[PDB]
Amino acid sequence: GHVETVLALLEKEASQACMTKKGFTPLHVAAKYGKVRVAELLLERDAHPNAAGKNGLTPLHVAVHHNNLDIVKLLLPRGGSPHSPAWNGYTPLHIAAKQNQVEVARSLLQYGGSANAESVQGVTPLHLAAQEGHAEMVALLLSKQANGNLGNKSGLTPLHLVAQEGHVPVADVLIKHGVMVDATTRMGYTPLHVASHYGNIKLVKFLLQHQADVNAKTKLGYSPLHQAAQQGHTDIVTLLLKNGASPNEVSSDGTTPLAIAKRLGYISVTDVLKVVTDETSFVLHRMSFPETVDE
């Protein structure tokens, strides 16, 4: 970060195509190390921000990983990359949400933002924002207009992920906005099913209030009970049963919530579930897990 040295290098016309084996650009180290006085020097030679290496990364993507936003706010008029994805198809929106800077939403709001762009998985920036579910996100995301609950390849809707992490705040914000409470996955799992597998009574109570069905069955017969029993989360199973969840529902494999609780040797659960459950629909080991976005 010696700026007058770079001024000396400028008259010698060093190329701005200086590319390493890792795919870095001269803009990337200025984005990382926060040595930024040379940025106006780099634009004296009319630098172009659109530059993607082997990993397809942009100055904004490297900038948001370690944010010195004063450069980015001025790069945006200097032909900034509005919807640039990474090699993973990742937009700056959801990675900025996961990094969760306080003004990065305002930084993109200076231009705008798209929180529905498809990744290589099919996940939207709205869904990855809801997965972290920060405090300012549920306020700011309102200004952006996007599908409130957006499925992925799995069919995972923001509500589903919120139930997975059991973030009550986000689950509230989302229900208030009018997202689908019982949104289903490609296999047929709802945010209740998923919360019951998680075993979070809070992430289940909230959903009960949201009116997600307590007997929502999967395409293979698994219900939020079967799931709480396989998980061994007696708390969630009791919360379901108390709220009317049926305990005598046979799945596509012939195992009820009791059958499962038993096979898994969970006794605390088996005591309530086995008695609440009626006699097993059939005389007799495939489990049931909700979908999740891949790495």
UniProtKB/Swiss-Prot annotation:
Modified residues (Phosphoserine): 246, 268
(3S)-3-hydroxyaspartate found at: 182
Source species of the chain: Homo sapiens (Human)
Subunit structure: Component of the ankyrin-1 complex in the erythrocyte, composed of ANK1, RHCE, RHAG, SLC4A1, EPB42, GYPA, GYPB and AQP1. Interacts with a number of integral membrane proteins and cytoskeletal proteins. Interacts (via N-terminus) with SPTB/spectrin (beta chain). Also interacts with TTN/titin. Isoform Mu17 interacts with OBSCN isoform 3/obscurin. Interacts with HIF1AN. Interacts (via ANK 1-5 repeats) with RHCE; this interaction mediates the primary membrane attachment site for ANK1. Interacts (via ANK 1-2 repeats) with AQP1 (via the N-terminal). Interacts (via ANK 1-13 repeats) with EPB42.
ANK repeats: 1-18, 22-51, 55-84, 88-117, 121-150, 154-183, 187-216, 220-249, 253-282
Name of the molecule in the record: Ankyrin-1
Shown chain mapped onto the complete sequence: 514 to 812 of 1881
Entry domain remark: The 55 kDa regulatory domain is involved in regulating binding of SPTB/spectrin (beta chain) and SLC4A1/erythrocyte membrane protein band 3. The ANK repeat region forms a spiral around a large central cavity and is involved in binding of ion transporters. Adopts a T-shaped arrangement, in the ankyrin-1 complex, in which ANK 1-5 repeats are orthogonal to ANK 6-24 repeats, with the peptide binding groove of ANK 1-5 repeats oriented toward the membrane. The rearrangement of the ANK 1-5 repeats orients the canonical protein binding groove to directly face the membrane, to interact the membrane-embedded targets RHCE and AQP1.
Gene name in the database record: ANK1
List of residues that carry (3S)-3-hydroxyasparagine: 116, 149, 215, 248
